Write a protein that binds this ligand. Structure first.
Ligand SMILES: O=C(O)c1ccc2ncsc2c1
Length: 119
């Protein structure tokens, strides 16, 4: 019933993601010199370094807010890809399955801790 435990759990999950080869296209902001039309398609850029910085600055109040920004990385890849068979989109799909399998328990434990506090 530890209400603060999600923060270290999210830091450790981001460490695993940065070790995965599939995260390489998503670690830093998409390079606008390599992809000059990117901001004609994508309104709100997001990347894992920005998520980690926001966490470490104390600017997430809940793991749900972190989960919204990581899901934006994946939805931006799906909206920008020219093919649902592309290399970089195929990487985003595998990474999203890994993220979703690991974030599940973080969110369940946090919500359980809040309910116990409110009891
Ligand atoms: O060139 C592609 O296939 C492609 C697909 C998704 C994507 N997400 C950020 S950069 C990028 C490039």
């Amino acid at each position: 019933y530890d209400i603060q435990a999600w923060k270290k759990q999210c830091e450790e999950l981001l460490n695993l993601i940065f070790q995965c080869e599939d995260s390489e296209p998503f670690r830093q902001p998409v390079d606008l010199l390599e992809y000059p039309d990117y901001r004609d398609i994508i309104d709100t850029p997001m990347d894992f370094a920005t998520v980690r910085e926001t966490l470490e600055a104390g600017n997430y109040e809940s793991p749900m807010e972190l989960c919204k920004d990581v899901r934006l990385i994946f939805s931006n890849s799906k909206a920008y890809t020219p093919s649902k068979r592309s290399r970089i989109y195929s990487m985003s799909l595998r990474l999203s399955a890994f993220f979703e399998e690991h974030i599940s328990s973080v969110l369940s434990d946090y919500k359980s801790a809040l309910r116990f506090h409110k009891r």
